[PDB]
Amino acid sequence: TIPHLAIDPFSLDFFDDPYPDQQTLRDAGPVVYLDKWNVYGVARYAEVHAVLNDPTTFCSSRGVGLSDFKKEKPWRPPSLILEADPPAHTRPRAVLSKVLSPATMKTIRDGFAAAADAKVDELLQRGCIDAIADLAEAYPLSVFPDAMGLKQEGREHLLPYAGLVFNAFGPPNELRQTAIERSAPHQAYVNEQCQRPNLAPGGFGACIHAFTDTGEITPDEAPLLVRSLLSAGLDTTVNGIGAAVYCLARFPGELQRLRSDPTLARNAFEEAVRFESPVQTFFRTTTREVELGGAVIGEGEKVLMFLGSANRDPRRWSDPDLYDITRKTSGHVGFGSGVHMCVGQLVARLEGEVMLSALARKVAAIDIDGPVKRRFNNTLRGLESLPVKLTPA
């Protein structure tokens, strides 16, 4: 009943151009079996959305990577939020929700926007830049570690730790095993910065620790929740802003629309999250036998969701393969959906908005003027290098 496919969604060929293989996955049926890794796959919007929105049947506490925590030892202590189910999930979720709240956004917005304008002005002096190292990486690196309250020393470890995290959701291929081999110093740095004494007053980290007396979390939970923000909050935004710039460079008509109405900046970023989905895939584990898209999946089975594919499903989206900054994007699953829907989305959107705003006001053209290089990762999609020429408005 369920079709069996030999496509490896964690192969370099697949990362290099996933879209044909994703259509193959979608069109094979609502539920496929991937023989390469012995997991179920869902690549259509309807099923991805369904799975995300049934956390009881499709749980996160057995890991959202290939590895099933009931069978194997997690490579690091489980995340208290990503890798928990309700009810254990609920109160740590509420804390991060309050730390990364509207009111917090209001306190950091002017500083994030100043840094974005400053960076763009700086890049315009150089003219010819690498939009990944010099922009997509540089800008979040200039605001997010400070917003966390991290010391200056050791920040070089943040992006490698994050790449390690996203590679570790994948299967035990060479990307994963190589990241884990080199992980020790990145883990040591991160875990040490998660302790209260190391997090500057006023920051997200110190705020998490200050929530440890409300009865929502205990002091011994706070360092792992800081760990969550250091895992999830930098590299994703780097790839999201990277996606946006790449899109504006490939769709000059849309840069021109953005320039003419900079208030389109927030939706232009959202549409880039749909179009390139920085977080491409991750898993759930079935807690019982279940019927999904007319197919029967047994208990204790891993289910691979293709978020990027869901976001390009022509069953859901008109002209899914176009970047349209005035698209009604609501419903996209680039930030997930349901109880685990990205708790950091206000931070991401704020970074993305104020950067695209800066570009909209200061830049007349973005032309690729060098070889584009992709960065390969088991679950993150994004570029290694994007040489562009920026023309000042």
Ligand X SMILES: CCSc1ccc(C(=O)O)cc1
Q: Which residues bind ligand X (CB under 6 A)?
A: 64, 79, 81-82, 165, 227-228, 231-232, 279, 282
Separation CA 28–CA 331 (nearest Å): 23
Q: Is 336 in the site for ligand HEM (CB under 6 A)?
A: yes
| Contacted by 187, from ligand X, ligand HEM, Cl ion, none: CB < 5 to 8 Å by type | Cl ion
Of the pair 119, 227, the CB lying nearest ligand X is at 227
Return the residue of 76, 327, 332, 349 that touches Cl ion, per CB under 5 A: 76
Residue 332 CA to chain centroid, in angstroms? 13
- Neighbouring C-alpha atoms within 13 Å toward the C-beta of 80: 20
CA distance to 127, 268, 273, per residue, from 365 (Å): 11, 16, 21
Q: Tell me whether residue 284 is annotated as binding.
A: yes
Separation CA 58–CA 304 (nearest Å): 11
Separation CA 329–CA 20 (nearest Å): 23
Measured from the Cβ of residue 270, the count of other Cβ atoms closer than 10 Å reads 24
Two tokens, residue 68 = 């099933």
Of the pair 104, 187, the CB lying nearest Cl ion is at 187
Count of residues in contact with ligand HEM, rule CB under 6 A: 27
Q: Is 31 in the site for ligand HEM (CB under 6 A)?
A: no
Return the residue of 22, 61, 183, 228 that touches ligand HEM, per CB under 6 A: 228
Q: Is 187 in the site for Cl ion (CB under 5 A)?
A: yes
CB of 345 to ligand X, least distance (A): 11
Q: Report the run of H or E that residue 282 belongs to, with start and end.
A: strand 281-286
Q: Tell me whether residue 375 is annotated as binding.
A: no
Contact 231, 179 (CB under 8 A): no
Q: Is 53 in the site for Cl ion (CB under 5 A)?
A: no
| Contacted by 302, from ligand X, ligand HEM, Cl ion, none: CB < 5 to 8 Å by type | none
CA dihedral 174, 74, 82, 353 (to 10 degrees): -30
Q: Tell me whether residue 340 is annotated as binding.
A: yes
Q: Is 273 in the site for ligand HEM (CB under 6 A)?
A: yes
Return the residue of 297, 343, 355, 360 that touches ligand HEM, per CB under 6 A: 343
Q: Is 356 in the site for ligand HEM (CB under 6 A)?
A: no
Q: Which stretch binds Cl ion (CB under 5 A): 7-15, 69-77, 245-253, 278-286?
A: 69-77
Contact 217, 211 (CB under 8 A): yes
Contacts 24+ apart (CB under 8 A), 133-139: 133/385, 135/241, 135/245, 135/355, 136/238, 136/239, 136/241, 136/242, 136/245, 136/382, 136/383, 136/386, 137/238, 139/115, 139/241, 139/351, 139/355
| Contacted by 165, from ligand X, Cl ion, ligand HEM, none: CB < 5 to 8 Å by type | ligand X
Contact 175, 167 (CB under 8 A): yes
Q: Is 223 in the site for ligand HEM (CB under 6 A)?
A: no
Q: Is 101 in the site for Cl ion (CB under 5 A)?
A: no
Q: Is 379 in the site for ligand HEM (CB under 6 A)?
A: no
Q: Tell me whether residue 157 is annotated as binding.
A: no
CA dihedral 112, 116, 119, 121 (to 10 degrees): -130
SS3 232: helix
| Contacted by 76, from Cl ion, ligand HEM, ligand X, none: CB < 5 to 8 Å by type | Cl ion
CA distance to 161, 203, 225, per residue, from 154 (Å): 11, 17, 19
Q: Tell me whether residue 4 is annotated as binding.
A: no
| Contacted by 229, from Cl ion, ligand HEM, ligand X, none: CB < 5 to 8 Å by type | ligand HEM
Of the pair 287, 378, the CB lying nearest ligand X is at 378
Return the residue of 32, 49, 59, 60 that touches ligand HEM, per CB under 6 A: 60
Separation CA 247–CA 242 (nearest Å): 9
| Contacted by 207, from ligand X, ligand HEM, Cl ion, none: CB < 5 to 8 Å by type | none
Site of interaction with Cl ion (CB under 5 A):
76, 187
Detail the residues annotated as belonging to a binding site for heme b.
89, 93, 284, 340, 342
Detail the residues annotated as belonging to a binding site.
89, 93, 284, 340, 342
Site of interaction with ligand HEM (CB under 6 A):
60, 64, 81-82, 93, 96, 100, 228-229, 232-233, 236-237, 240, 273, 278-279, 282, 334-336, 340, 342-344, 347-348
